[PDB]
């Protein structure tokens, strides 16, 4: 275990995560270092979950966990190495925009990784642009499973372990009892739109602000749109009744198919929100291809 660690050359910090090299094979990897003596509560729950769940998921669009090294003070996760995260890429693309064909390629792959997760009873729960990794070949992969949960038994909603606000689904905001696979589809929809428009769909300042920004765009849900909304814990009957914005104005660059898919990914009732499995069948991906990004590396 200490012999294994000796076999790694640290190249540079990328996240703590280091780009690293295997001295014997020449393989390039990402090392996620985890100090254990900073809490004295044992292996962290995030680590337990990330490792056990991740090593169950082998898929081209899910970051590959190559190895785990557990000494007495250190725990290391060895991952395949990728070149950058989507958040940085979107930043670099601000002036130009990300080409619609690449957006389609990315959303397509992300849905495949996510579909694989869900059909193996893993919720990611933290899908946001910086947790998505891309390489120079035009591949993109789901990463950071620190918040991931197995849902063979239903997963209870937790105040502290929540996805960052901007990508948080309305069920969660309105205080639902359990997570479902739908919260991941929501986050993806949010990311899809953001890649298209160069701006976050729902950049809320607070829980209630996040909620209203969603209401202002998609309309304030009612019992017809979403049976049960009015009964949900944090639903107030005193919410403003906004009307649903015209979708071509919300994502202008998108065609009919793209508007179609996005609105199904953003459907209010999580029972009705499209699934990754089904989203993949959508005519939007009729012509999908695999462009390569211009990475400013």
């Amino acid at each position: 275990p200490l012999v294994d660690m000796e076999n790694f050359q640290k190249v540079e910090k990328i996240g703590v995560v280091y780009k690293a090299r295997n001295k014997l094979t020449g393989e390039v990897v990402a090392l996620k270092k985890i100090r254990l003596d900073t809490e004295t509560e044992g292996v962290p729950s995030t680590a337990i979950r990330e490792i056990s769940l991740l090593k169950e998921l082998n898929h081209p669009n899910i970051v590959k966990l190559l190895d785990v090294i557990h000494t007495e003070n250190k725990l290391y996760l060895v991952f395949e190495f990728l070149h950058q995260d989507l958040k940085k890429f979107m930043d670099a693309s601000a002036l130009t925009g990300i080409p619609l064909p690449l957006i389609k390629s990315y959303l397509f792959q992300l849905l495949q990784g996510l579909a694989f997760c869900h059909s193996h009873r893993v919720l990611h729960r933290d899908l946001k642009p910086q947790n998505l990794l891309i390489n120079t070949e035009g591949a993109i992969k789901l990463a950071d499973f620190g918040l991931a949960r197995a849902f063979g038994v239903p997963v209870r909603t937790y105040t502290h372990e929540v996805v960052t606000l901007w990508y948080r689904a309305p069920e969660i905001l309105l205080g639902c009892k359990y997570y479902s696979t739908a919260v991941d589809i929501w986050s993806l929809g949010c990311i899809f739109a953001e890649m298209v428009t160069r701006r976050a769909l729902f950049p809320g300042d607070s829980e209630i602000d996040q909620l209203f920004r969603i209401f202002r765009t998609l309309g304030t849900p009612d019992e017809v749109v979403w049976p049960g909304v009015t009964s949900m814990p944090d639903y107030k009957p005193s919410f403003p009744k906004w009307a649903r914005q015209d979708f071509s104005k919300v994502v202008p660059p998108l065609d009919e198919d793209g508007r179609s898919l996005l609105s199904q990914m953003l459907h209010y009732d999580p029972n009705k929100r499209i699934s990754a499995k089904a989203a993949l069948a959508h005519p939007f991906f009729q012509d999908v291809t695999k462009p390569v990004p211009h990475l400013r590396l």
Binding site: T40, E41, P44, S45, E56, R121, G152, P154, K277, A278
Partner: protein, 258 residues
């Protein structure tokens, strides 16, 4: 009823065959015995009631324990250390808010050190090679419950109860798969509460027939009948609570008429 529902059941069936401990491990243990295991598991049930932990947590811990014991000799005096580490790990995996190490050292009554427990957590992780996402009887019951046409909360409680009981007695239950023990528990509960039987939808879903379930069903019925006479009682006590509709007080059918 979700649509990854079917993919997932299939996957769990795939997995339950891999997480499987050696059925005869106990006669290869130099120092511990089924009885000692029963006492340990019944204790874990108690711990779970004290710390208000989920059933899934309990089920996962038993899995970890049975697997660890399939390849590690353990002495009487250390068996509880293994169980404690197992409970702690299962909590970290499944609970939203896992108790802290200290709390686990507290309930072993300072038999062991915070150090020992954390050292054993490490060892169990090594032995189990971080594969903690095991299929449980609990999980399959949850799947089976959706195919409950008239959804009935006493049936669910009673099935939970029967399935939890199987955790206690390594003989015979170590020789059945979770999906199967689940099938027996669902049917037996459903038959006791409503007189209905292992439904057509589940026969299709699982490929288990009432006939295939019979051997396990026979065992589970026996355990159910004898439950009040069993040396370990923590589960019956637990399932007297209002939360479980007092189902452990329900009288088991005299015959299954299979």
């Amino acid at each position: 009823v979700p649509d990854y529902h079917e993919d997932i059941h299939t996957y769990l069936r795939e997995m339950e065959v891999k997480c499987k401990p050696k059925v005869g491990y106990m006669k290869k243990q130099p120092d511990i015995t089924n009885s000692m295991r029963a006492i340990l598991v019944d204790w874990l049930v108690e711990v779970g009631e004290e710390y208000k932990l989920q059933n899934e947590t309990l089920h996962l811990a038993v899995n970890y324990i049975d697997r660890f014991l399939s390849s590690m000799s353990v002495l009487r005096g250390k068996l509880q250390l293994v169980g404690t580490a197992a409970m702690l790990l299962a909590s970290k995996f499944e609970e939203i808010y896992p108790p802290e190490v200290a709390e686990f050292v507290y309930i072993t009554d300072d038999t062991y050190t915070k150090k020992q427990v954390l050292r054993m957590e490490h060892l169990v992780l090594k032995v189990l090679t971080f594969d903690l996402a095991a299929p449980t009887v609990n999980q399959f019951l949850t799947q089976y419950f959706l195919h409950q046409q008239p959804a009935n909360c006493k049936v669910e409680s009673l099935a939970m109860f029967l399935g939890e009981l199987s955790l206690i007695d390594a003989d015979p239950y170590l020789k059945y798969l979770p999906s199967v023990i689940a099938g027996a528990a669902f049917h037996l509960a459903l038959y006791t509460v409503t007189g209905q039987s292992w439904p057509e939808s589940l026969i299709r879903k699982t490929g288990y027939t009432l006939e295939s379930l019979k051997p396990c069903l026979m065992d589970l019925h026996q355990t159910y009948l004898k439950a009040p006479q069993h040396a370990q009682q923590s589960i019956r006590e637990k399932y007297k609570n209002s939360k479980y509709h007092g189902v452990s007080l329900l009288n088991p059918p005299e015959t299954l008429n299979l």
